[PDB]
């Protein structure tokens, strides 16, 4: 813990607790003074203090009861995709079963139904066929004791079957029926009024039919006909509804989404049942690419009988298929083909008959997409890659996502085990191939091999042995995962290679589930920060206990109206008084609830100072209600990212949620003083945010007077055969005399790779944009998995790193320059570089083409300016021939020196190297002057703002865009014609005002001093309340 004291974290009165205790578990010390006790729940029962622990002690006793249940009657352990859905069902909330197909998720609705019929409650089981009625009926009666009655209705059973039924439900003397779908079409409206506390679907798709059946299951468990109405016309109307909090509903449960629901219905779940009938994309997948170079018909006979058997051929138009189907024939194989007679031809391949069946590439063709056998569907083999047509001049591009189709007919999680498949590409187009293999990187990351790497007896290992394990009863050891992120923007990414199965609305948040090989993965965003500093109360929102400060945090309020952030407990906004306010007190008790129901959590927050106070934050109000937490650090929002972040999880690092406090205490109490002082006399608010900025703003005011006095007299010398020259002074000689030329050869080295700093000056000055709009385009880039963390202060390239750059100068042909080169060997983060061997070009051209479409073209601009910089850094120095020339003009030398030509090309490929034309030893003419004036000290730019916070040492890579902006929005910085930044009249009297009265605590010394001593709490160095201290013997000296 960091000693520091949280609002609305206690678990059992919703109060004020300190971090001490909520990382120990404990509630408050009002709720209990004890620091030790053998149990919370009859310690608070003790004290009579229970409020809203009971509901947690309910809850896992609740919970074990159904384990202990399933247990008892299935004779089986829960696994652990049923145990994420036993703690949803206990609390009474409605889910998809986001799980690969299996009889544990049929089995886990009848245990349901039997332990709620245990205490009285009734259930519903619907199935869609009347065999899955009759065999569920028979499963059930076994089980159950004979208290427990068991009601079923179908058109196969006899007159008197039916009519026990009958009496039954008119009777209301039943606990769990068991009917079909057909029923509910055929009764809705006696369902209707009928209500039940648990509604179990086993097939959707025959709900989703008929648009009557969804509001006759929102009716079963008692949601209004009024509110179901209502809500579908906002829902097309295109808002989302809002659930009545009087409203309980019962527990409805979607046995498998099947990707099929495409009508506007489904979405009434989403508003009143707060779960989302997901299409489910499984992008899970466990497959090698082999690409064979020749398109022979021999080859591909030895490739046949190594596989043997499982075997998808995919052609690129039918005429190449019936060739293949024929020379498949005249050899003996057995060969099947399905353009002529599909279902036929399959069901031969199904059954063992046909070992190789031929099918047409297309996209969602039924080959390709609409069959799902991945037990028999073993090697697809493509004889050509298949492409499409783009433009209207019919260009011939790869299809990657038909590749991807079909190519996932061979893998997917079967029975719990993700089956290994192979996939085959016959090409001989280097270009179509590479073409392809980007487009798979981005998309899938899934690499390409040649035919040369791959081991086939390793793959039909890898292939048989997988489909055994899935065969037999496996052992369970499937887990959820919850994973907790502070940007929508880095879910949306997660989601694409994890996959959006299902989404739950919980309160604020809104939490999505996916399936990998490990089991169901949760993952949620709490959009920004979830705790800030205080207002009143102590020092500025800090007290001071036994000598010590203690932080005080509240839940953070963001209007959505007009934008406006604060801390305090308000039912409307300060500013415009809307009561759409964004609460994040909901985004934490909503994390609360989803850390029960998850096995373990992990709290990726972006890896940086900030990062880890956010992560700090959330753990220790989530410890209360779990214990399994860790801290992950994404350096790249990719599956390589994430598999990294979790090779390296640890916990909290304190030592960087105190430098992250000490930092914002700075600002508090420094801005909060002078804030105060500058509000009285100039009647604004917030006009010092911190210290930084009152010191960068002196550069600026003092740049004035340095820009003015620096004028001096120059005069532009044009030479007849040579290159501009500037020169100081007037110029009256009408000829320029070389006394010396030096020529000689050297290597030049590339630029490092791009750090926070350097690349917003660079980037800003060449596209002309300020700082502030490029560090916002450099973190859509990285929070959508195209670069590296763009927070750095370090130019290490890793191993990996350097991989990339080789990748893509193979992949060009221009591998003969490339030069690996680690750079710096500290440093918590890498440079900024690109995470795929695609440039900008390539990316564009996927943009157009529709493959992504979040990248617009000032960020593909930012991305080739970090390409390229990094693949220099990568790349052979360029030899080059170079002179220095001594020149006499008007009796004064000047030394020029330049490149005139290049002898070997290397990293100037990238960052292209200018060249001069050649001096000789002789007297030039001279054409043309210009006369003119400039200023030996330039004014100040964005970029170079940048540059002399870097070099005076104050300033993060989290704060360099901000500094500069606050100054533009505060009315103290103006831009002028040039984009050159000058001092307002209003900006040069408030440091004026700073000067006289408080120069000292704003002087670059200071900032500098105080940024050192930060960084060494950062890494332990200096202590964290020894530094407060330091602080607060300053401002208290200011305050007279
Ligand atoms: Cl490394
Ligand atoms: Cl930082
Ligand atoms: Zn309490
Ligand atoms: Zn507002």
Request: aromatic residues 10%; proline residues 3%; contains cysteine.
């Amino acid at each position: 813990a960091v000693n520091s004291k949280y609002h609305h974290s206690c678990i059992n009165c919703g109060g004020l607790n300190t971090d001490e205790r909520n990382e120990r578990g404990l509630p408050c010390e009002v709720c209990l003074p004890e620091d030790s006790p053998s149990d919370i729940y009859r310690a608070l029962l003790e004290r009579k203090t229970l409020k809203e622990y009971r509901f947690y002690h309910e809850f896992w006793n609740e919970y074990e009861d159904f384990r202990s249940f399933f247990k008892k009657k299935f004779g089986k352990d829960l696994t652990g995709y049923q145990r994420l859905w036993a703690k949803r069902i206990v609390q009474g909330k409605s889910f998809t079963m986001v799980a690969p197909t299996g009889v544990g998720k049929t089995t886990f609705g009848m245990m349901t139904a039997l332990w709620l019929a245990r205490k009285g409650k009734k259930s519903a089981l619907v199935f869609p066929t009347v065999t899955l009625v009759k065999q569920t009926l028979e499963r059930l009666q076994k089980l159950a004791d004979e208290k427990v009655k068991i009601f079923g209705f179908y058109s196969s059973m006899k007159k008197e079957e039916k009519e026990k039924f009958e009496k039954s439900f008119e009777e209301d003397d039943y606990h769990i029926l068991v009917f079909s779908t057909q029923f509910v079409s055929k009764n809705r409206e006696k369902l209707s009024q009928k209500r039940f506390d648990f509604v179990f679907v086993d097939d959707v798709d025959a709900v989703l039919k008929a648009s009557r059946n969804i509001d006759t299951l929102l009716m079963m468990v008692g949601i209004p006909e009024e509110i179901i109405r209502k809500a579908f016309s906002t829902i097309k109307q295109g808002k989302i509804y809002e659930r009545p909090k009087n409203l309980k509903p019962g527990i409805l449960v979607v046995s498998s989404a099947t990707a099929k629901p495409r009508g506007i219905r489904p979405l009434l779940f989403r508003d009143l049942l707060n779960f989302t009938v997901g299409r489910l994309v499984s992008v899970a997948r466990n497959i090698t690419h082999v690409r064979i170079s020749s398109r022979s018909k021999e080859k591909l006979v030895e490739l046949l009988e190594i596989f043997r058997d499982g075997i998808l051929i995919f052609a690129q138009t039918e005429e190449e298929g019936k060739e293949l189907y024929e020379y498949l024939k005249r050899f003996k194989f057995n060969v099947g083909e399905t353009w002529s007679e599909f279902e036929k031809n399959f069901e031969d391949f199904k059954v063992g008959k046909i070992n190789i069946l031929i099918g047409v590439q297309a996209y969602y063709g039924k080959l390709t997409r609409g069959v799902d056998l991945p037990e028999r569907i073993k090697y697809v083999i493509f004889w050509g890659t298949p492409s499409m047509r783009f433009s209207l001049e019919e260009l011939i591009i790869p299809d990657v996502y038909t590749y991807i189709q079909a190519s996932g007919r061979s893998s997917r999680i079967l029975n719990g085990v993700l089956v290994k498949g192979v996939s085959v590409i016959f090409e001989e187009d280097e270009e179509i191939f590479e073409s392809l293999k980007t487009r798979l990187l981005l998309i899938a990351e899934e690499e390409i091999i040649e035919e040369a790497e791959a081991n086939w007896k390793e793959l039909v290992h890898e292939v048989e042995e997988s489909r055994r394990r899935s065969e037999r009863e496996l052992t369970d050891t499937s887990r959820s995962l919850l994973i907790i992120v502070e940007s929508p923007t880095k879910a949306e990414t997660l989601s694409r290679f994890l996959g959006r199965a299902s989404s739950r609305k919980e309160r604020n948040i809104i939490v999505h589930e996916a399936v990998t090989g490990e089991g169901v993965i949760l993952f949620t965003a709490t959009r920004g920060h979830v705790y800030d500093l205080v207002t009143k109360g102590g020092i500025h929102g800090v007290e001071e206990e036994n000598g010590k400060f203690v932080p005080v945090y509240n839940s953070l309020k963001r209007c959505r109206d007009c934008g406006y952030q604060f801390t305090e407990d308000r039912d409307e906004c300060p500013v415009c008084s809307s009561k759409n306010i964004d609460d994040k007190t909901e985004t934490l008790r909503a994390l609360r609830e989803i850390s029960l129901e998850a096995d373990e959590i992990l709290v990726a927050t972006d890896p940086d100072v900030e990062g880890e106070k956010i992560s700090w934050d959330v753990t220790q109000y989530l410890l209360p209600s779990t214990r399994s937490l860790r801290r992950i650090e994404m350096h790249e929002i990719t599956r390589y990212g994430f598999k990294k972040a979790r090779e390296s999880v640890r916990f909290v690092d304190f030592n960087l949620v105190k430098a992250q406090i000490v930092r914002r205490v700075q600002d508090r109490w420094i801005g909060f003083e002078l804030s105060g002082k500058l509000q009285k006399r100039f009647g604004r608010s917030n006009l010092s945010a911190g210290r930084v900025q009152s010191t960068v703003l002196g550069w600026i005011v003092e740049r004035e007077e340095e820009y003015k006095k620096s004028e001096k007299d120059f005069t532009l010398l044009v030479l007849e055969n040579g290159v501009n020259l500037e020169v100081e002074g007037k110029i009256a000689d009408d000829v320029v005399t070389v006394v010396e030329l030096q020529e000689a050869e050297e290597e030049k080295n590339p630029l490092p790779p791009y750090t926070t700093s350097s690349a917003l000056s660079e980037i800003s000055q060449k596209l002309r944009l300020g700082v502030q709009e490029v560090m916002d385009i450099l973190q859509d880039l990285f929070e959508k998995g195209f670069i590296t963390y763009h927070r750095t202060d370090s130019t290490r390239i890793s191993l990996e790193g350097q991989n990339v750059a080789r990748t893509y100068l193979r992949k060009i042909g221009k591998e003969d320059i490339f030069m690996g080169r680690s750079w710096s060997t500290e440093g918590a983060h890498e440079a900024i570089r690109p995470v795929k061997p695609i440039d900008a070009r390539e990316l564009e051209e996927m943009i157009e083409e529709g493959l992504i479409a979040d990248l617009t073209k000032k960020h593909l601009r930012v991305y080739e300016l970090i390409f390229n910089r990094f693949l220099a850094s990568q790349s052979a120095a360029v030899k080059v021939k170079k002179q220095i020339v001594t020149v006499d003009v008007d009796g004064k030398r000047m030394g020029i020196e330049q490149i005139v030509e290049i002898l070997r090309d290397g990293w100037n490929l990238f960052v292209p190297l200018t060249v001069s034309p050649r001096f000789e030893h002789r007297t030039y003419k001279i054409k043309e002057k210009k006369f003119y004036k400039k200023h030996t000290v330039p004014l100040f730019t964005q970029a170079s703002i940048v540059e002399e916070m870097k070099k005076r040492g104050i300033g993060r890579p989290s704060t360099y865009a901000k500094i500069v902006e606050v100054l533009f929005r505060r009315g103290y910085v103006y831009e002028d014609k040039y984009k050159r930044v000058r001092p307002t009249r209003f900006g040069v009297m408030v440091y004026s005002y700073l000067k006289e009265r408080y120069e000292k605590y704003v002087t670059e010394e200071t900032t500098r001093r105080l940024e050192e001593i930060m960084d060494k709490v950062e890494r332990g160095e200096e202590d964290y309340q020894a530094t407060l201290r330091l602080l607060y013997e300053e401002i208290k000296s200011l305050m007279e």
